[PDB]
Structure formats: structure tokens, C-alpha cells
Design a protein around this nucleic acid. Structure first.
Length: 53
DNA sequence: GGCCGCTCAATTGGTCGTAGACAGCTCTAGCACCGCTTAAACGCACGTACGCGCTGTCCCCCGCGTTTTAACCGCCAAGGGGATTACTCCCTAGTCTCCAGGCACGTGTCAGATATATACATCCTGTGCATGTAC
């Protein structure tokens, strides 16, 4: 989360950085799964094929 | 040229025996559950202390009503990739057998890490204040 904050041009850890920590690593992502993060949002995903040619 | 006469190879009908698998025992034995304790801690009833959640009027970017269009929806017919089903042989799944060995449980007694009485102390939570990060 602190690396996600520092990479995304910030320093104060907030729920978005926790969602970025959880969803970039498959073993956090399977451990938490269907649980939800207050104002963490969803990990960036403009879907393939819908991304224009 | 046609139909029925004697024989014997043929479906179609009731008791014997078994085996699965409950059903109800048919007890019976044992181990939990019930009984009637002795007892004390959590819950209620009770009030008390108070944020906290309802309910009042302000005010802007958001909600919502109409504009063309262009790419997406979905149709229609082509068209060729490929799934089903035809059929027989082949082989390994089923089945039960049985061994002999491992190891799950039984079950015995010993003993050590745990609960807990109570005695310490330092750990880390509410409030305040200093000041800098995301907007």
C-alpha cells in the first residue's frame, strides 16, 4: 500500500492504496475475495475488446 | 388344388428358496440424562448523563426533456467446419477375492502446561495540541 501510494504520486495511505495492495497480488485477492473496502473503489480495468481498435 | 389329421416343440400359469434391509423389536446394559441439591454472577430493573439522530430553510450542478446521427443490433442467407450417430472390435473397469501388513482406535497410568489466586507494574487509550498533506 505504501509503495502504491508513493508510485501514484502521493504519501498518505488511504483506502484506494489498500485496494491497490489487495488486487495486484493474487494471494491477497483470493484471501479477501468478496469482502469490500470502504471508498477503495475498483482496480483500474477498461476492458479488452471494448478498448477500441 | 385345397383343408384338416396326429405328433412334438412351444408360450403361458403357481411353489421354492434367498437376500436385501428394514421394521420392530427383544432385550439388555450402560452411560447419559434427570433430580434435587448448594450456591453466586450475570441480567434485569432502574434511573441517570447526553450525544446523537430527526427536522427547519438556503442554492448550483445535477436531473431530466428534445436534438441528429453513426455504429451498433440483429436480421437473413450463405457456406463450410464439425457433432452426432452409425457399428464393430478391444481392452481395462468391475468385482470379489484374499493376504499380510499398516496403523486407527482402544485403553491403561503418569505427569506437565494449563487455569487461576492474587499480587505488580508498565502498556497503551482518551484528550489535547502542534503543524503539514491533499485538495
Amino acid at each position: 500500500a505504501g509503495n502504491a501510494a508513493r508510485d501514484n504520486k502521493k504519501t498518505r495511505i488511504i483506502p484506494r492504496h489498500l485496494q491497490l495492495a489487495i488486487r495486484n497480488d493474487e494471494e491477497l485477492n483470493k484471501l479477501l475475495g468478496r469482502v469490500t473496502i470502504a471508498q477503495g473503489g475498483v482496480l483500474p480495468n477498461i476492458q479488452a475488446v471494448l478498448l477500441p481498435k
